């Protein structure tokens, strides 16, 4: 277990964002975004966990930072659900450990790009029972959502910001959109943003995220 | 061993465009495009072969039309040089049958989308040592172009048109660009056109292709 990166804000922390990378990245991959975001969120800590290094099946059993195994790309987007649940669990433990440092749970946010965003949806809307600040889900989807999903009263109260590129060929706009609807249909306060891009992050995307968090902190 | 789709032109054919589809698709994939172009190229025949049905490893051994095996994606890609060469070998066969039909090698063009393009690159610039009209590469790259790449006098004389999407997340824009650059350094007349799009084909791009061809046969 590689330890999460923790990036001190400018003033003392009274808020946190836990931010998970996608397949093959590491804890550094979203440092530049975190730091950019900390130019205006003055009291928000950014925690950047790293996924366990494990065989990835579409990559030939190549061992890399992975939240869960992907086994085929198509047709079936088939994944390891057990591993996914072990990660959702590790993230839950991260939320608890941030609370112990004195950050209030209404001011902890979970964020996730691609593979990472799949784990954030499961942790928030399947596992978590407390207050939470927000889910930000970048170029992602929720392979463990479906028509049987029911939210507790507490889970409905977690707002969610959902972002995607129009031209994503690895997680289709449609999948990103399905996860959003799933919660929209069910009462969750949830925003959708699309940008003209692929499976990546834009500056304007970061700006928007910065605006939504600050609105949630204020 | 499924047979090609041959669309015959409005006038006696004196040219030929062999178009190979992408992974998982069939010989009907580009039939609409070929028909669009024929309304412009009035003497130009389109023969659309189909990739044989094989296991694809990265798709879980799911059997689907496939020009060669993709065994991994990242960080080192892995494919089947063997099946690539029997696909290459079978394009060259579609060519010397068009020749026998009574078409001249100088107005036979090869065209490829994605996995098809990597097969057309290998046949034009590695196997074929004769006259050829030209290669059209769409959203693709050249797994078999490396530093040791060396063209012959006749291969250098084949023109190419390389087209790609800015936000392609399946075959990185850079992978398509690198094929263009290996061909350019080696004396080949290549043209590169980029589009605001993912892994797909646009109307403009299909308009750009028809124009290119009308110049090649003009």
Curated annotation (Swiss-Prot), chains A, B:
<dbReference type="Pfam" id="PF02230">
    <property type="entry name" value="Abhydrolase_2"/>
</dbReference>
<comment type="function">
    <text>Hydrolyzes carboxylic ester bonds with relatively broad substrate specificity.</text>
</comment>
<dbReference type="InterPro" id="IPR029058">
    <property type="entry name" value="AB_hydrolase_fold"/>
</dbReference>
<dbReference type="GO" id="GO:0106435">
    <property type="term" value="F:carboxylesterase activity"/>
</dbReference>
<comment type="similarity">
    <text>Belongs to the AB hydrolase superfamily. AB hydrolase 2 family.</text>
</comment>
<keyword id="KW-0719">Serine esterase</keyword>
<dbReference type="InterPro" id="IPR003140">
    <property type="entry name" value="PLipase/COase/thioEstase"/>
</dbReference>
<keyword id="KW-0378">Hydrolase</keyword>
<dbReference type="InterPro" id="IPR050565">
    <property type="entry name" value="LYPA1-2/EST-like"/>
</dbReference>
<feature type="active site" description="Charge relay system">
    <location>
        <position position="168"/>
    </location>
</feature>
<feature type="active site" description="Charge relay system">
    <location>
        <position position="114"/>
    </location>
</feature>
<comment type="subunit">
    <text>Homodimer.</text>
</comment>
<feature type="active site" description="Charge relay system">
    <location>
        <position position="199"/>
    </location>
</feature>
<protein>
    <recommendedName>
        <fullName>Carboxylesterase 2</fullName>
        <ecNumber>3.1.1.1</ecNumber>
    </recommendedName>
</protein>
